[model samples]
Target: THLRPYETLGAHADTMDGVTGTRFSVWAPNARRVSVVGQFNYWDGRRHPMRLRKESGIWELFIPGAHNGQLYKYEMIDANGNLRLKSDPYAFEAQMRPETASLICGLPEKVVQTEERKKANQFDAPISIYEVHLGSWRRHTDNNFWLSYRELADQLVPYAKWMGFTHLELLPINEHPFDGSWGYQPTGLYAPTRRFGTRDDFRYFIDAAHAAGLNVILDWVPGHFPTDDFALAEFDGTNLYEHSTLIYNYGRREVSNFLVGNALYWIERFGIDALRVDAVASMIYRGGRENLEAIEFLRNTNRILGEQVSGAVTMAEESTDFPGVSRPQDMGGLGFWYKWNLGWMHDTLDYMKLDPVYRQYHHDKLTFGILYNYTENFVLPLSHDEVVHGKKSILDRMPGDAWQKFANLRAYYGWMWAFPGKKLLFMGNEFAQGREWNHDASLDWHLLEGGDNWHHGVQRLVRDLNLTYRHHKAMHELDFDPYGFEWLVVDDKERSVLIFVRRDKEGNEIIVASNFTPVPRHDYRFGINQPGKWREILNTDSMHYHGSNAGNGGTVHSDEIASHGRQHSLSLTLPPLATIWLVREAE
Candidate 1:
């Protein structure tokens, strides 16, 4: 098997009977001379010249006085004789950005994965991810500063738990040079960014998440990096690690090994639930064609992670129609467990933005995703990308008056939760934040203060959606299988109403109906599977959620009449631009 990396890669501390020092090893392929340069030796090369191992092009040396918490870099004379100072690619810790020295913290203590955690990640489990940016989720009011990892645990964990989310997917927290990048442009793949807290503090956050019955998922980027000179761009005077500013040379063993190893290292080191891979479409293709080197790299990494970790899942944020992204490795796929459903988001949002009077002509937009709903195990996400880049906030994008905007937002959330896909919603979208997301500032929590009715209503609907989704097997148990869903009213374009049924493996079911126009739907009859009392378990427009309280008096009975080609039928009122859920009760 390929050597388990990082164990033999990073700066490791060694104890020599009454003395302690650190051993450094780096994979710099074509350098004439390499030395460990740091403050201890005044950045001198002669005193610590490293011996090159010809077999792997790795340079190695040990210095007796260097210890943990010290800063260092590799001084190298490349093939072209240009002396360059490069930060360690495998460094477990790094100095804050703008000071490019690698910190010498030893690898963290390995974490243990439990059986309880494994069951929480199974395919049938309910997974509603709340995507977050730690810096912007909340901040101290006194100084308007970001929350520490521990501080986030105190506030974020419990709040998400109360909201009934199954997981929290953080934007990339890898050490990035620019805060504006939102951790996407990372320099230290192995080092946790020092902006939040220390390595131990990050560990504390993960531990707290599990304690509160929530899972932690970190966003990971391995496709390309920035052109920062001090990082991995031109190691050894050539594109040994990168092909450009740069895309990874995945064909290179050392480059692929470094990334694959880091993928495994994070799971074992912190016991994270998953790594939501960013920009996968770019990595697997170039110039409108395939890149086999990058494809094989992902296959190998996913295979290793599956074998070594019990329940670690991986997802991709790919926008293209790449076949089998969530398919298994043995089946000629990329081996991801989930893929973002960008098509659904786009189609639905476009439909929502159109004037209500124009919806009948574009009805297919709401039902088109069903064509490929089962293609990849899908994660329906209204991510940060949608609200940024002047696209408009999810609430602001609606084409309507203030009342209709809030109505549209509530109705859309209803459709999503009823749809047959695992859910992922960006943070501010939960309460209908008025403006687009800004990475530099905390979310506009002030709008949610004073218990604003509309804001509270949107939030209340989200909480109920989560709790109801979790408790009902029919909602999530068959999310990835075709047998789980059946459409009832796709052809009702004139009414712009949709009705569907979701079923569990055990044959239990829930009926979902949505009205997209601001016209109350009265006597809306839909087919039913059985003849029994059906309770209106949740209605988005109820006065409880700050709407006009229009609904069928809490329960409706199935009538023995044919509708939608079934013997049993249901008749009820669907509030204006709202969604309602009904579950059949045992007589």
Candidate 2:
């Protein structure tokens, strides 16, 4: 005889013989006694003592009058005969910070996902993600109050839609205690943080995003939780939910079940399109050795997600050179849909910080990424990590005068979008916010106000880059295959310039060229496979982008000259500190 704990582990509403009530259950294997205490019963444990199911260690009870909106916790006596009261780990909703009571509520209604939306999440799709932190994205101007989830849906969704981002990747929103942690050190892994609103309100946010053609990606932390006594930290007065040396407590059935169930809960219950697993590198880096338990748990969780969720994807934020992180599990790997390209971020940022006079000496830094880029399905992320902790904003990181700094940033952004990877730019980076990010305040939306066309200029460039990326098949279709990319001018270290061609399966090619120096190149010739007119589709230095407007006059035709081992070549003006995109007209 066996008991199924997961099926009834969380609170659920049911009508047993016409008597409607909420049934509460908990897993406290080391508890000598267990009870449910709620305001409905005057917080008296004796009033609703739960019955322990034999050796299962799971306590269950059905309170005839305990209904919705009730606040509750589990009252338990540990095997050592000590009393402990704790919130439910599987709580659907929790009280806002400064208060830590689990709200008694059933799972919200599921939002059905459309087939077309599901199709957009595949590996080949254009996924230009706009990473946002809901609390800091925008706040009440009068009091600096956080926006509710619904308010974000009203404001954030429309902005991302206008910016043409295919996905809105939110920072961790699981319930947490400290405002500083940014939801990274969560206490309630299952509950949506009440800082926004109720669970239903959060559901509405996702629904609104899906309606606007934006996929929602949540930052999920399953590696380590806060040492909050009221939560998973020693829930049963034992190392029940953490790693206990060789015993592998984290791999324990109940603990693993809780995390895996929460993953399914978010995707199935709220229609989340993807989960970006945070601190994955730290998860397996326990004890200065690989934590096999955590590794297996992740593989199992991803395997379950693939089987259960129709089109949802899981991304890993592992920073190390862990082998086969994004490979399929059947191929003996972690089976992630994408991995953050930390190496690319570091190398590119390091290269950009150098003065253009010395940039040629570090030219390989920019070209070296292609040597290993196809190893994993990488997402080139200019994430929040680069903008905090006195590191300076992306715009400030460039080593130059004020105008040159903005030009460098714009060129870098264009080059990043043209790179062979999925894209993720932090909230304020798109518009060249001068200061580093402050989580307590809103982004400098005022920068887009009067007289400053620089910020507005960067914003327009990002918008054009986003739409252009999504519009072109060559830009995104062959992101993971080396066959789709070709280096047409990689040996130009003296000029610190790069010219490459990205090709789609349908034989369409798009050319991207970047000039890293302030000095423009005149009559700079590059070979092309096609002989028709090569139109300058997008130029970061064009007058439309607040640049010096140094570029070819809309189009350049390939002459009967041989260059770079090609029969056709085009002579054009390369703008200073700018990246240009060109497409050949149909023959």
Candidate 3:
């Protein structure tokens, strides 16, 4: 139909205000006339007469007391006598499955207590997240299947808490047309997927998490919308909300704006603490097959929008090698609180893939100092994205003997804690779950014993490290301040050994030293700051860790190694795959 400009069209239904009765209105210029069709009017376009409000070119029909769940679409006749039927652009429930336009509400009010809304900011502290993809996490298990919200929450919470995770970051829980998009093809912006359960059921899940003191962050994908009907596409025979001319960005600005608005909607309505922005690189890159302007614009806009929101931060999967994307914007960069530090993850994994002899020249692989040059706010992510999908498990990444593999990972994580960035470990990583993480299956619960006891020990080490980090003011600061951090010496790079010192905000200092080699080094020595009492704080090879290697656990009496001028020294047997943290006592 060749519709002229300024034609008035209206959405009519059998009931208004709800099923009982009510009125609705719409404006579609360029059409001679329009009728409402769908379940509400039995697809009979001729039965409902819509009145045109000439002042605004809008067509209105009032049918008092209209109830909810009224599905309808528009049938229009253009000036050229061409007839057409299309879906509404602003459908709250765009039921693509039934292929009908449904309307409910624009947003949802959490049935949660008001206090929960006030405490949304609790997520920022040491966020260790477990990302869940619902469809794959677990499906119909027998005829007794379909985990109730309470059941899933009760089961998953303990594992998360026991593993020392702070938050449960879930993928989009919105009602999507395809279960495989991982909740990305959302047709219902405000509705939780009915396939999972009821609205209250979802709320119950959130409430359960809150009761356990674990924050919930949602992965929001606002980059693009599914190219399906019953969405903000082809409404009123013209582009009403979207651009008439297709946008050029990879996902298109029309889609990007949809995503941005959606991001804001969830946080404001649901009190989500953090949002992990997916495909930020693709979303922010260019158009016409080359990502140019979007890369810069998306990053800049993300920061601006994030800051405007209260008590919430946005983290992006910005895989670009662009320097300082995670740095504060005032430092001439995007203002995101942090960017995923893929560089460290890749390098560490690569080094683990290499032999101990090859690690010396690859010390660069161990150091992010050069890249940061003393400045960068990054997230050291060993995200699930890397470990699964046929990639070797963390334990399998080791290059040498059984003990060597464990020691190498220990050294790397030890180095990780000292690196600049917040840390995030995937679900199965803590207990070193023998298999690659699979959402459909529970983590290898049985593997926590026997040959896998080392995994549990590793898990404990991570827990203790996180606990220490939380307790110490120096380690938990906002940025990679590096105020009182310094490397004592490369020491014996030939033996794959490194020594460094870290000072707290309280002015107390600890010297952490480690040797990655399987052989013990004799009389290994490094210069210390001053002569004083230094006691042991932590040892990785302790008995509790199920480690077979010998290590001196607990405190050591202060003793001088260098007899004369350089008296600040302590000598002890260093174990293979071991680390020691020494703290100076107050005078």
Candidate 4:
């Protein structure tokens, strides 16, 4: 038998059919002996001794008449003895079950197949996501139990649908050991966290989300594993799950192959549409434990896995200034479809923290195009990182008293939306979560019952942003696609203002104007891309969002003037700390 590098293919023909009682094989070229263990055999490494098939440096075994729904792993005899590592190519399903993580057998006959499933929307569309860590988003109060998926679905569905977001991105929903890593320290890649609900409960929740027309992006951790004893670490009392420290330190093939296989497992089993890879920056940073070969292997793996699974997309959380992270493969960059724009998050937060009077010094903010433009698809996210660790809520980040707090948040949200990028908001950010978000403690649920709070107003504005964003193609169109956006000095520097134009195919154009200053600007004449009848569709000051009334009763009309070669001229009475959307009507 030819010893081809099979895992590189990523399709994993051996595990493709996902039938029960099937034979399985893996390549452990140098091991003295290998055994099989895990959910299928209760992790009994000795009963199933894998034969050295053909001595072609491959290990193979067949369990006759055994059907699917068995969780299993391989135990290899190396310098260390009797090590059990979870099977990397597991197909069916694994629940983050207690005591031991096991694989579910094949899907029941009634379960829908891949082709029968509904396809998600465009990968590059303008997206606003709500990030959730399932274990903590909500919980039951009376019994002091974590809320079930059914309960969460019943409560969250209305808010997600009302928010007009295209997708809901979850932090590692997988079964993990350290809850504080925010699900980053995962052990069961295929299982949903049992802390929140049961296996069927998770299914119903995902189905309900689909019913509500929201896409779910799962957070996948493939680059590293937690060292918890119950996890993959030292399985069978040896380092069976991971590469030898020496081999990996020297950049061996096993390390990349291991992670790539994990990637394929989740995508195939869960039917997850997108993967947000955590700590990608750490994946290849040579100065640290990372190296070029390891990075290349992961990239090659992404290409193979994405091609094998249609609509499989990758979003890398790369904190480093890794060139080509979002670049095409030919450009010597990792061919991830998108990357988290961490620079924008940090810089923008720096600007948001400054005293309003001193913001002019930072007027030169947000100009790093390479970092801001294509850095990982540019996600302007107010994620959980900002709200926890003694950090305050989104409103609490404001620089002043109660009124000023609300005002600053209003200005900040408006400006953030106006910027060109997809958006993500952590749970509890919509309403004023008075204290830092605690995974163990429930959200300030009572805070919602009170009168107006800073968080409530922010949530309302986010809905407005999403609604206006979907209505305007410029906001959602592919950012790097030629000429999809154009910005103007609607009133930059003078009144601390910024305005821009966004358009897509067939010349659908809309103007986004934002003023960060506290004082209103009178007669703010703005330029347009073309002259036409412009109408006001959304005003942040409208009564619906519970903001100070300031605009033309939420509707206005524009007259044409041949200013910028058939441009329509309109003077907007720009309200301080508000975003205004105006769209040009078809002739």
Candidate 5:
């Protein structure tokens, strides 16, 4: 048995006797013969035949004068005596596609997490992620070409920082032949795509992101792979990496090992702060104990990574109510640190699309999330999926004219930020891009230049919402506990309004009230625990944000009026299609 399979599975540079050469190895149990063929040997398999280790299926060859930067592939004779060429599954680099040759490159030095990164990714920390698609986030103005990794680092990192986001969560960057898949359907799991730059250039981008106090997360896809011929499909002339006629078989030992090893590799090699595992609902199928192996595989992946990588986190994009998604693995759980709240996204978006006349009938869509708010640690996301494929942009989804549409979008952002979860907003949503997302072009950034500052108003509100969420401890400290949130006006269905209180463990509170209708409320009163001056910290209707400026001037005092089962109450002017955040000031 090969003791450390990964150590000897791929090509490695070494010195043998008196000469330096490259050592190539592969595991193909059913192959009758395996040979190394590349530029070093004029693409001829007969020149460098491999020797199989006794009792182990691994084949190895050490070729003298084989140097780095050489493109190569493996030639194997299958059980039927047919020769087939394939790329190395564990290669660290590959030639840019339309060509499927793997390259010979040594691994980089190990990357360790700094103290600041460890603290920034903690459970109680504020994590507002700015989700981006690098190929489309920005491009060259002259020719519309995709920016290099170095150019993205120079532009995207500082832009996210200036927007007050705590993290940058990029879509998949793995090598894929189809641009339309948006890197989701990957062929090269171990190598960064060469479409942008070299692997070292990708590393430079990560280092630059961390230096700017921004954590980076990779969108990891371990659920399924593409059906490319030279990839991990029928890898050894058998159902080795996958099952015959099945999408993915996660129960097998070698398949599980390959995926779990890749998780650790990204953290240790690239210094990634976290991984957002994609399409987890597809892994754990609906059956009892039959799919136990798939469940165990997910648990083992997170458990191993969490123990080894300090401050490293794992999240899931699971849709169903699979229990204990964010719970610890030792307690019979999946061991993820966070999960995307798909239910919240669905309900809130459905509610926002309705006209004001119909919203009160479906008011539960806005308030029903609290019934299971603390089920798992959630990240309230407005992702790219909601905008693409004819779903329309977020601005286009609102049911109103131009002015009311912008107001509704701003109000919804405020409500999402004040909710009990971390936040993730997709690109172009911040400035209310008018068109649907297109992979071939940059976001409609030119919309900000014209349009009477309507787009600018939306962008500024998103910036302030991010900063406010970070500043308030009550907004994020107890994100996983039910006691952190309390409802003050859940039964007000006729008015289509919501008022709630968010609190931290130390009893600090922030009161958030939202009005869904276009009609304002002049004498609205809400309960308060203490009789002090309640300061209006943020109002979406304020003139600074280009709204109608209908709100409490700055502050309002509490009195002994006894409302909503509380000892004190305060009167306020609730603006139309707006949300207001108030914090009680010191005496």
Candidate 6:
């Protein structure tokens, strides 16, 4: 039933070996007559009224002259005999902005790589994601035009690879009529946005991404769409696809199939490694209550993806208090591989935006997340949502002078990287972009011209953070379990010092000691399991990071003294407004 719609609908150009024309089909159930109106038909609906397949409510027509690459739309006479223009709901490709007509492109060739299976999304793997807006990362630099997918394969992929990120989660790549939508509520859910060259070029981009050993996550929107007339708003003058505020009428069978089929299309045909579900809370509930119909569609869709695909993963960006969002469908859950840890991001940022003097009173903001750390497979995301629309850049949210601001951001990243969850950082945030993200322009590339400045320092620390997250097993392994993490110093609110350790099943350990205020700690005593040297692997306040450079010697030795609930205690210097990673050197 899911395949029936996309399989038979749209212009199937490859009907048979000898077939010259295209087979077109459109589903306008309530319409009396439908025609494939385009430049070929001179936009005249009367010339080619399609034959209705009464059983399926599908209208079809085979025009000898109409072939692939021809742009078309459906002209329909509704039940009331009022005519309307509707873009094909199953269009394979659509025109660029200012135009939303469907193009007669072939369905994507199967790009699945069965032999190239991966466990990158598994709980044990180190998943460091770089969230990006493809167009704004870097433009042509000459004409300031957006980079095509083919061109980005050369430019963006290498940069992400060089930065040591495991994944590049792109903003929605679907076609939309207006740039204002920002590809969120795209009208052409079935079509790849023409802003970035053809669909073929997109696959090339994916190929290059995979070649460089990186995963790709497409931001997918299914909960709602815009109310554009040519879109799926009021087809056949009925609430066929749209309900309140353009939410999908998921109660309907065909609408559910349409949404589910689109998910499969991207993964099966276009080699998409993952789909990040955008606006998940909007789908599951209606007016603070469960939408049972949409729930059926969602659970079934997640189940189908697992049954069909080899190694594709799905993510949810829901911030609501919905339970079991990342649990299995059979466990009465939504069955997502990961869910965004929005609460942690919010609380942490809320704490950061406050003055350091007031941070001690709100210390619970930092400790509260650990209480629910193992509840779900959380992705500790500094996502795009936090850095746009009057919220200002993440850098701008930090409270301090320019020096303290850079130091605070560095410490935050250090703590974030050391924390027990997969990491997801938005673009421009890595380099500490001074302003909010503007979709229209490129990232501040000129700011990164010098490699010795604060901006470059933050970017460098990120590369190190990403590399360290991958190389250090303790940083990522057992991210969803309590066994991997332990607190050594949590009650020192006045001093604003936090100490914790992340452990791996391999019997390895790495420690993170942080100072949230400008007041540095000298010879700070913290307990350890054994008596040996602890190597300072990374220090956010080191001179390399444009910090005060005050830290312990490269290593600190533990003494035979009881402190912080352990037999052996170590003394160390904790830098102001910074964090450091320590690993006890093995025998």
- For 1-587, candidate 3 gives per-residue lDDT tens digits of 11111111222234433344535555655556877666667778897767667665556675444445666666777545667675544343445355546553334463332444334333224555666665454444445254556666777766666666666778787767765566766655555666566555677777777677777777775555445444555445555444442332323443344445555655655656677766666554444554554555556556645555646667766776555665666665655655677777887788778877777777766654535634546677887787778897787788787766776676666666654466777666666665776655555656665664677788877777666655554554533556557666553557777777766656666777776767765555656765566666666666566665465444444456653235666565666777766766667
- The runs of at least 3 residues in candidate 2 whose Cα sits more than 4 Å from the true structure, single-residue gaps closed, are 1-7, 245-248
Local lDDT at 115 for model 6? 43
Q: Please provide, for model 5 over 1-587, each residue's C-alpha lDDT reduced to its tens digit, 9 standing for 90 to 100.
A: 22124556788898998999999988777787889999999999999999988466678899898989999999988856778898988888889868898889867668999988888788688889999998899889899999999998899999999899999998988777787888888888888899889999999999999999999999988886656645887777887778653466777776677788777778888898999987787778745623677788889888778778878899998877888899887775798999999999999999999998899899989998888877788999999888999999999999889999989988898899998888999999999998999988999989977556888888888889889888988988888777689888888899988999888889888889999999999989878765789988888987777899999987789989999899899888999999999998987
Give the candidate number with the greatest lDDT.
1
Q: What shift in Å separates residue 320 of candidate 1 from its native position after superposition?
A: 2.2
lDDT of each: 0.87, 0.86, 0.60, 0.64, 0.86, 0.85
Over 430-540, each residue of candidate 2 has an lDDT whose tens digit, in order, gives 999999989999999989889859889999999999999999999999999886789989999999999999889987889999999998999999887878888988899
lDDT of 4 by residue, 1-587 (tens): 01123323111223425543556565555566777675556568777888775545467776654445455556767635544454333323444534553453433122232332223335447678888876677767786577777887887766787988767888887677667777877666555667766656776777777678777687887766555535555433444446552223214445455556556655554445677877776667744565766577667866776566656677777876878886678777788877777778787777777776776667656444323474446677788878888777877777877766676667667667756677888888776576888987677777767787545666788888788777767766756554666766532564567777767776677777766667777777766666546666666665566668676544345556533333666677777666677776666
| lDDT ranking, best first | 1, 5, 2, 6, 4, 3
What is the TM-score of candidate 4?
0.83
* Model 5 worst lDDT run, 10 consecutive residues: 1-10
TM-scores of all candidate predictions against the true structure: 0.97, 0.97, 0.78, 0.83, 0.97, 0.96
Candidate 3: residue 357 Cα off by (Å): 3.5
Weakest 10 consecutive residues of candidate 6 by summed lDDT: 112-121
* lDDT for each residue of candidate 6 in 1-587, tens digit (9 for 90 to 100): 55536877888864456667778898767888788898788888888879888888789898777877888888888877887888899888987667767898768778765444357767789999999988688888789999999989998899999999998899888887655566786778888888889988988898899899888899998876655645777787787787645577777878877888888889878888889987787888664497887777778888888888858889998867789888998887998888999999999999888899888999899999899998889999998888788999999999988988898999999999998889999999999999888888898878889546999999989999999889988899988888789888888999889998899997677889999999989989988765788888899998887887888877778898889778888898999999999988877
Off by over 4 Å in 3: 1-106, 110-125, 136-148, 184-190, 227-257, 287-308, 327-332, 373-375, 401-404, 439-442, 449-452, 521-523, 557-567, 580-587
What TM-score, to 2 decimals, does candidate 3 have? 0.78
Estimate candidate 3's alpha-carbon lDDT, on a 0 to 1 scale: 0.60
**Candidate 5 Cα errors over 4 Å, as ranges:** 1-7, 286-290, 330-332, 450-452
If both were scored by TM-score, which would come out higher, candidate 2 or candidate 6? 2
Candidate 6 off by > 4 Å = 1-4, 15-17, 114-117
- How much is the lDDT of residue 351 in candidate 5? 96
Q: Is candidate 1 or candidate 4 better by TM-score?
A: 1
Superposing all C-alpha atoms, what RMSD in Å does each candidate have to the true structure? 1.5, 2.0, 6.1, 4.9, 1.8, 1.9
